[PDB]
Every structure is written in C-alpha cells, then in structure tokens.
Amino acid sequence: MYDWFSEMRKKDPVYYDGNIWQVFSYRYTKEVLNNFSKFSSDLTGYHERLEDLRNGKIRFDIPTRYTMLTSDPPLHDELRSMSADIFSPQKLQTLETFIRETTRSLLDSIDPREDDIVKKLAVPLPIIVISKILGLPIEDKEKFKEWSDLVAFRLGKPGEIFELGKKYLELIGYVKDHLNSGTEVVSRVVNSNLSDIEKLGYIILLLIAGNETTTNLISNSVIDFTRFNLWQRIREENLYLKAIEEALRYSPPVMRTVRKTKERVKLGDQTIEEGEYVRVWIASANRDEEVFHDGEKFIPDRNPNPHLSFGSGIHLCLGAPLARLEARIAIEEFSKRFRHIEILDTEKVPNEVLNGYKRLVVRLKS
C-alpha cells in the first residue's frame, strides 16, 4: 500500500475515482477529520431518528448502530461526557499494577521454546482489562471473542443492513444480565435519558471496540522492534513510550476512516459534492514526507510524533490513554523477561485496511 500512498501523496493528495473520495496527505486528512461541520460522522442514521429513539418508538434495531462513534455534535458531546473522564490519564493510572500483575501472569504461560504470543499475550490482555474496568465478567472468552468479530468497529462505510440475528441476541442478552454488577461507567449510562438501545450501543462499544485494535498494536510493536532489532536499545536507552508511538505511526492498527460531507466543500483543490463519502487514509498521512522527516524509516526516538493513528478532533480515540498504557506495560515486561527473541512464524490478518496478526509464534529462550 505504501508505494501507492507515496505516489498519490506527490501526484494526487485528494483523488476521486468513480464512487468514493480518497485523501492521502497529512494536511487534508487532518483538515477532514477536524472539520466536523463539513465532514460528518452521521453514517448510521443516529440523527435522523434520535427523537423516535428517545420517544421509545424503536426497539428491534442493531444497538451498535447508535453510539458516539457515529455521531455529530451536540449529540456527540452529550454521549462522550458520560465517560470522558473515566479513561483520562491518572484516573487510569490507578490500574498500572493490575495491568502489570496480569501481564506477568500471562507471560508465565508462555513456552520459551515456542509459543504464539497473539494467543498467549496480545488477545487476552485487552479483554481481561476492559472487563475489569466495566465490571462485566467474561466467562465466554471464546463465545465472547465471537461477538467482537461480529460487532466489528473497523471504521469503514456502515453496514447497509442493520437487521438482528441470533448471535447478536446472545450478546444483547449477556449485556442485560450483567448490566447490573457494572462499574461507575456503566451506571452513568444505565441512568440517563438515553433510550435503552442507545445504552446497549454504548456498553457494547466500550466493551468491544478497542480489543482487536489494542491486540494488533501489541503485535505490530513486537514484530517491528524485532524486525529492526531495537529491543536492546529500547531496553537500555529506556524509550518505551516514544517507541510505541513510532509503532502506532509506522504500523497503524486501522489504516483509514470514513466521513460523509453534509455540505458542498472545496478540499485544497478539488471540490467534493454534498452527500459523497470520503475515505481518509491515516496510514498514508503518517508517512507524509512533509511532516515526518524520514517518514519511511522506523525511528524509535522521533519525539515530536504527531501521528493520526488515534484520530484527530472531537472523535479522537476515547481509549487512547488506555491503549498506550497497556501496550507500554506489555512491552516493558515482555522485554524484561526474554532478552532474546526470534520470530519463527507469523500470519497476518486478512483484511487489508488493518495491521495485525492472526498468530505470531516466537522462540524466546529464557
């Protein structure tokens, strides 16, 4: 994809084939993502039916169809308030030892001789931790992972259908059963003018949205650090944070997002019509030669690292702080225990707008 991005960046920053509009340069990607007035996130019809929703006239729809992720202000700001502060840093900092202890336990079940860290570390960590934060148990840890795949949240054009199914009913059932023993976060939502579906959409989101992505981050970080052998340096020079950010910039978990214009707008040259869809390539903008000097090189130092892997603007990842903490602790402990890693086998995730691994097997050697 990158060689393609390079060409588009130089020749056509804003390109329009037949259907959708594409943006490859840092500059416009940021302009599009930030200007929530001309590039909407109202892609599931959360707006043109909020009232019906609020006046309890809609109940057999897909819950996840109504979450802040696919909302515009004022609706957006109202929904985010309810949880903006629960994930904030320092309020999340009270979780460091739990994540550390957990990580250690998980690492313990790894066979230095040969094992799969995606299955042993990458996948477990984010779920165990999100479960702890929300108070919803995960006895499924498999039948649960099945729902995560169904509910997706991979930031592409919305699923046109929105019709129920049995697996989706299982999930909605699980949620209602434990919706009680939840933490403060859950209670805030459970006690709001929010329609009941909106409440379910909200929970499902916080509980599934970031597991896949955070697992991929931890995976990409492991490959990359090895790929360019930076473990020794990162370890001693102590640059875990800056290194995770290069990881996020170089190998972003999600390579793009979409927006829809609600007004005819001019984008630095071309002019996009009202109604059209816009696919914003985060992965491209992250290697934009003009903002990132040596953007094609993995520089663990790279201090001012203003990458767009978490978004930019009012929708900036609500869980950015948490993803960062987990990835850092996971990587810290992982390197403090093996001082040697050799990649035996890896299987990328199929989807070509994602950066992650089906499974990654390594030989650590004590």
Q: In the range 40-59, which residues lie near ligand HEM by CB under 6 A?
A: 41
Contact between 310 and ligand HEM per CB under 6 A = yes
**Which residue, chain included where needed, has tokens 């129920």?**
164
> What are phi and psi for residue 15, nearest 5 degrees?
-115, 145
3-state DSSP helix/strand/coil percent for the chain, to nearest 5?
A: 45, 10, 40
Among 255, 318, 325, 329, binds ligand HEM (CB under 6 A): 318
Amino acid at 100: R
Question: Is residue 317 within the footprint of ligand HEM (CB under 6 A)?
Answer: yes
Closest approach of Cβ 210 to ligand HEM, in Å? 2
- Enumerate the known binding-site residues for heme: 76, 80, 257, 259, 315, 317
The 10 Å Cβ neighbour count of residue 272 is 22
Give yes or no for residue 253 binding ligand HEM (CB under 6 A).
yes
- Measured from the Cβ of residue 25, the count of other Cβ atoms closer than 10 Å reads 23
CB of 217 to ligand HEM, least distance (A): 4
Using the rule CB under 6 A, which residue among 217, 222, 272, 283 binds ligand HEM?
Answer: 217
How many of the other CB atoms lie within 10 Å of CB of 278? 25
Radius of gyration of the chain (CA): 21
* Of 36, 38, 30, residue with least CA distance to 265: 38
| Residue 214 interacts with ligand HEM (CB under 6 A): yes or no | yes
Is 112 within 8 Å of 366 (Cβ atoms)? Answer: yes
Reading the block at residue 45, the tokens are 């019809």
Least separation in angstroms between CB 51 and ligand HEM: 21
What is d(CA 296, CA 249) in angstroms, rounded to the nearest whole number?
Answer: 10
| Stretch 14-33 residues interacting with ligand HEM (CB under 6 A) | 33
Closest contact distance (angstroms) between CB of 33 and ligand HEM is 6
Q: Judged by CB under 6 A, which of 14, 106, 155, 194 binds ligand HEM?
A: 155
Q: What is the DSSP letter of 120?
A: I
By beta-carbon proximity to ligand HEM, the closer residue of 210 and 364 is 210
By CB under 6 A, tell whether 254 contacts ligand HEM. yes
Which residues contact ligand HEM (rule: CB under 6 A)?
Answer: 33, 41, 68-69, 80, 155, 205-206, 209-210, 213-214, 217, 253-254, 257, 309-311, 315, 317-319, 322-323
